[PDB]
Design a protein around this ligand. Structure first.
Ligand SMILES: [Zn+2]
Ligand SMILES: [Zn+2]
Ligand SMILES: [Zn+2]
Ligand SMILES: [Zn+2]
Ligand SMILES: [Zn+2]
Lengths: 524, 199, 52, 237, 99, 197, 199
RNA sequence: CACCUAAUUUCGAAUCCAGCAUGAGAAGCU
């Protein structure tokens, strides 16, 4: 049922098909070998993206070119991070003058079918139940729990590390029964200095240039220079870094609980155009430059602290690749041990040593049975009647959903089983009514908020926070203004009332919000 | 008799294509979101009626040419059975020799089907007096149909191709006045045997 | 309806009056001037079958 | 392949590796049962064990050991999601309908039954109609009008058949049938008649529809024997 | 030859639709009628039991099945209806399986 | 019988804006622009053309004193007897003049740009609002074909009068701001309906 | 209405003129050479936003007179539909009676547009701290526009000419504080029936 | 050479039609 097209052999490749309804996962680059991989994939119904690194995200618009994907699904944060990554990847292919795989029209047509959804929210699509959880690689990283009818698959995609500062150190978990697990072995042999960055940055300030990946590592280093006191300023070149830093700030609710004002402080001053990068190259005032356009800053400099994979230094403590131990802890953090653990994504030696250490954990490992989810009736169906050439019975019971068995149980079974701001529902209703009459909450606002609430709770929190965020440069909310003889203090009070009312509404479930918002928006 | 003509047509869409949904339950499911659903299969692919378009094209041109062709468009009109389009598309006592398949898209729904917004504007005021939402098929979508002519003649392929060019000129289905349904056709025909399956 | 509402909520625990002749005459009048149409009389009948 | 051990049946099939309970060396996908050590000494930890009440307490230990434990027509759900979590059980407060077909049993909600009740209502209403079970012309004029509308195919054998069925149901049902058939549509401009064959214009076509209306109206006042002898000549059945 | 018995019932696969008859000059719908149809992807089962078999009976039946794929089954075949795809599972039995 | 072909070639004199209509092409583009121009899936610009001709002809024929129906009012019913009812359709008949969409001869990477418009306070002269809109550049060439099924002696004259009213008023959206002023060139010919045989 | 009002306005620039380029691709192309590119068409002619200048001019003078007029300059301010500027230049429901055209330059941008430069100068030591290259319009450049009033009232041309005189005093376009945009208008007004293209 | 902004609101419905026509038979074993 599962085909390892891309991720079976190499490290940079990934293409995981699951033919239940065909569901594709993580189609990415690593030209005719790519075309053969895409032809081997075929017509996929749902294409799922775990994280926004092209490694696992590159070959999605080409699939839109060949018309092989119906629906693309993925977290908002990695959806816009995938945009960002697609647009540069495209200008990298135009500056190097090599034929591209897809055009900008393919980028734009790839984002019409992309339905973002946040973590721990399940869709019942194509008779699968797809759920997303966090695994701490980047901000939009999700492990996919696909509840099929023939099994329960968990595609963990690039689990993070305990040496992370923006993401939750334990990765989230499916809370039910897991049958098949798909793991990684990128750091499956290499084991294990966050204060050493501070120490060398202290003892160096000649300004220090420190390069990294534009995705991931630069924001971790920005945090590590932010949380402690550093008097010499920290500076951003390489305008992928500033744009992903702004995406980190806007998508703040997709991070740690301790991080939910600013995030990275106002300590960094980004550099926008190339002329300021030239002036910074010719400057002699001490600072920290975190680039990712490095040569303009480097040819002057030539510490060059080198964080990454490759007074020149190397700090092997800012890698989001998962160590062996925490992969073992991820496996031992499942409610039931998985039946088969498929170990894609690594070199041969790391795959062999992790295969040896999970065989030593007495769990089966593949190096690329029948499960029958049955519905038990458990109901006396001898008392049946015929009305319209149908043998129906009026039924009164409970759909009990335990693992491997969605048993229907009667009322005698229930007899044997028996042995964020918060405003009230009338306050919420009167507030939404008053702000609907004075046109602050409009029909378009309620419809977009219902889309953002169907996305998830934190997506709606992010949307309402951006609509209510006052700009320090203009003093404009992005709200809709009231109607009448309202002074500025009262207008600010009703804006705060709208923010609190909509946050309260986010606290509620997915049904009473719907039962509220059809009274003001009949469509949604 | 011994041979039959196979006409594989591949039609690409140049201006947006609407063909209305026929199924009453599929309509009643879709009118909560789209006021004009597009004709669709249960396998989420777009269906277009094709036999009536070719037939109507051939009756219109063969009537303008002056040939003896009946019309099967008037109310409860019956075919005489002696025309040239009566042989191709049938009559009351004889079936049509050219079995014409539905135009089925090579792609699926949610890939060529796009739901859009249409307007009706006051002439004196210039305001959107009305609004509806209709479901269209995008431009460049590719549809595939087959025409099986059971008893081939010399003028069947020329008549089918002429009706195809008239469908290019008028549009295939839906709101053809507004500019919808302007398509183009690629034709590949071969005289296959009737006994090709008898291995 | 009564039994279904009763047991469906018991398991959830964890008009104007105008004359018939005037009704017929007014529906006939609004049908002639096309305020009430066959789509409206069918859709209202469908929502009437769904309840009051 | 069935091996043996110290009483252990080790039946290998193409689907799964059962072990009915020395231990084997291959994968024991399903195990059927100090035993924890018998579990822990066995390579490739089993998927789901198949285990008087002490069992359940033992199953709790098997639950704690991170091992799934089961304690001993296809049915489909057309339900919703809703959900809940009460007493470590994911539930759903739903009352519905068990529909029994030849191969499937499905669980449908009350909305499907309302669909079925609307269809059955619309079926029942169109069975009993009104009082189941005029102009005038001479009999011979009725003959030549029915012959003339038979030749030009306005009155066809099917129309004569439904006329005879609505005449057997009584006078008023047949009156309702001809007033439905001759009903000129105000928004369309057509009646439920077969158009005549021949080179005609609108005036004589409307006149021929009027004589069809008057002929079938005046035939209703006659008795059943004359109507039967009038219509067998045209519709022998 | 058995009948083609569907797997699903009328509420799943049968759908009532609207067919038309349009004037060629004024391009208006002159007539309109409702007709049921079986949807696409609906599956049907049949069993062909050949007693006193020959070597070429299965080739003949399979050739007829591919011809039914080429033309269609049921009615309204000229308008595009009835185009189908057949899967064949054959087997030799003896007549005394029941004995 | 005969058919009337009016090939119109439209050159764009001021900027042009027809908003997108597809939901999946707007909501996927609101993160980039606020008013996307109406497009094909082959990256060509679509303009509705029959409604502009109909609105033009109803304005001028209503103010000339002839009886024409007003299809501008909400849920209006065409009379079926007037000139625009015969040309552009009615309820019970269809339009003789089938009016194609205005297909651009160029893609969007050549004749579509992404502009930044503002809204400025009156007391203090400051940029209060900013929005971005895709506009069609000047001199972009569009083509369409009006096909008249049963032609009369006064259909081409009414089509040309509607085209001149369109060049005077504007086509598409944002007409009062100056957007959508166009220039039309007509190539009219009278084909036979049996010409493809 | 049966009549419409045509106002052919003609702008001659006494002061230098600047209106910035709206288009992002043309701005990114011109930013290598000129930091402040003037608004240009694809036919190398200068575009000026006219509507919004007339509306703002009439808003200030009709507010200072004391008539019940709205202010559309505030953030997401909706025009009420009940004043004379709402009837003239548009409201939310009802559109603008006065379709106001862009000011099309009569000459090409190779003849009427010059690249210039400006300095930010420190005040104590009197040297050019910043040098930046902008782009402006020469004096006497002619800009013709056409205002079409569909349902003309008696006080329409008077309000348009009052807004035009306010635009002459207060400037049109950008950089109005430092001296750009003082212009002069010539008005040619006529009344034409709407059916002037019929037959 | 910089720098701020890039949002927001309404509508998303209404109507016509759903009819005809044809064929109801004949063979063998028995
Ligand atoms: Zn990653
Ligand atoms: Zn990776
Ligand atoms: Zn004929
Ligand atoms: Zn009219
Ligand atoms: Zn106002």
């Amino acid at each position: 049922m599962i085909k390892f097209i891309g991720g079976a052999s190499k490290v940079t490749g990934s293409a995981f098909l699951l033919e239940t309804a065909k569901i594709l996962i993580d189609c990415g680059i690593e030209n005719e070998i790519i075309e053969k991989k895409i032809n081997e994939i075929g017509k996929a119904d749902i294409c799922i993206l775990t994280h926004a690194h092209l490694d696992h995200s590159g070959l999605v618009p080409l699939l839109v070119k060949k018309r092989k994907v119906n629906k693309i699904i993925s977290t908002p944060a990695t959806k816009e991070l995938c945009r960002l990554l697609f647009n540069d990847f495209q200008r990298i292919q135009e500056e190097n003058n090599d034929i591209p795989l897809y055009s900008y029209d393919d980028i734009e047509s790839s984002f019409e079918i992309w339905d973002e959804i946040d973590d721990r929210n399940t869709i019942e699509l194509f008779d699968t139940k797809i759920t997303f959880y966090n695994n701490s690689h980047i901000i939009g990283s999700v492990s996919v729990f696909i509840e099929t009818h023939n099994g329960n698959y968990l595609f963990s995609g690039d689990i993070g590390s305990k040496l992370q500062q923006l993401m939750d150190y334990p990765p989230d978990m499916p809370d039910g029964n897991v049958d098949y697990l798909i793991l990684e072995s990128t750091y499956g042999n290499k084991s294990h200095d966050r204060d050493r960055l501070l120490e060398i940055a202290k003892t160096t300030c000649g300004k220090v240039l420190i390069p990294s990946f534009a995705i991931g590592r630069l924001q971790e280093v920005l945090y590590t220079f932010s949380n402690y006191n550093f008097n010499f300023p920290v500076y951003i070149d390489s305008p992928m870094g500033s744009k992903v830093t702004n995406l980190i700030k806007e998508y703040n609710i997709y991070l740690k609980k301790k991080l939910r004002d600013d995030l990275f402080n106002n300590k960094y001053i980004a550099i926008n155009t190339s002329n300021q990068s030239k002036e910074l190259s010719n400057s002699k005032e001490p600072a920290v430059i975190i680039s990712a356009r490095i040569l303009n800053h480097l040819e002057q400099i030539k510490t060059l602290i080198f964080v990454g994979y490759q007074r020149i230094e190397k700090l092997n403590s800012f890698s989001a690749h998962a160590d062996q131990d925490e992969l073992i802890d991820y496996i031992e953090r499942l409610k039931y041990t998985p039946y088969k653990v498929f170990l894609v994504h690594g070199e041969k030696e790391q795959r062999e040593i992790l295969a040896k250490r999970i065989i030593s954990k007495k769990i089966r490992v593949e190096l690329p049975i029948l499960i029958e989810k049955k519905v038990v009736l458990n109901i006396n169906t001898d008392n049946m009647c015929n009305f319209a050439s149908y043998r129906l019975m009026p039924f009164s019971g409970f759909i009990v959903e335990k693992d491997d068995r969605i048993e229907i149980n009667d009322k005698n079974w229930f007899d044997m089983i028996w042995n964020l701001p918060d405003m009230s529902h009338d306050k919420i209703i009167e507030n939404i009514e008053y702000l609907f009459n004075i046109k602050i909450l409009s029909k378009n606002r309620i419809k977009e908020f219902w889309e953002e609430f169907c996305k998830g709770q934190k997506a709606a929190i992010k949307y309402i926070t951006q609509v209510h965020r006052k700009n320090p440069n203009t003093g404009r909310r992005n709200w809709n203004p009231p109607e009448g003889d309202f002074t500025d203090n009262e207008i600010e009070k009703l804006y705060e009332t709208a923010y609190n009312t909509l946050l309260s509404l986010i606290k509620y479930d997915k049904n009473k919000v719907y039962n509220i918002l059809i009274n003001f928006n009949p469509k949604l | 008799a011994k041979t039959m003509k196979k006409i594989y047509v591949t039609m690409k869409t140049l201006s947006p294509l609407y063909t209305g949904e026929v199924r009453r339950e599929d309509k009643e499911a879709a009118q909560k979101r789209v006021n004009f659903p597009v004709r669709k299969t249960a396998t989420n692919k777009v269906l277009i009626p094709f036999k009536g378009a070719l037939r109507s094209a051939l009756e219109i041109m063969l009537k303008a040419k002056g040939e003896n062709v009946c019309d099967t468009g008037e109310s409860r009109a019956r075919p005489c059975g002696r025309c040239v389009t009566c042989s191709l598309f049938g009559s009351m006592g004889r079936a049509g020799r050219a079995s014409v398949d539905f135009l089925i898209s090579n792609d699926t729904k949610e890939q060529i089907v796009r739901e859009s917004t249409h307007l009706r504007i006051e002439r004196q005021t210039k305001s959107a007096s009305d609004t509806f939402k209709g479901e269209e098929v995008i431009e460049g979508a590719t549809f595939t149909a087959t025409i099986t002519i059971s008893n081939p003649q010399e003028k069947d392929l020329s008549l089918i191709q002429s009706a195809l060019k008239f469908i290019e000129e008028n549009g295939i289905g839906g709101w053809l006045n507004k500019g919808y349904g302007r398509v183009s056709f690629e034709v590949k025909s071969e005289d296959v045997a009737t006994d090709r399956f008898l291995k | 309806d009564m039994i279904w509402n009763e047991e469906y909520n018991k398991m959830r625990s964890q008009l104007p009056d105008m004359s018939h002749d005037k009704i017929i005459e007014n529906i006939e009048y609004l049908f002639n001037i096309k305020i009430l149409s066959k789509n409206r009389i069918k859709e209202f009948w469908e929502e009437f079958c769904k309840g009051q």
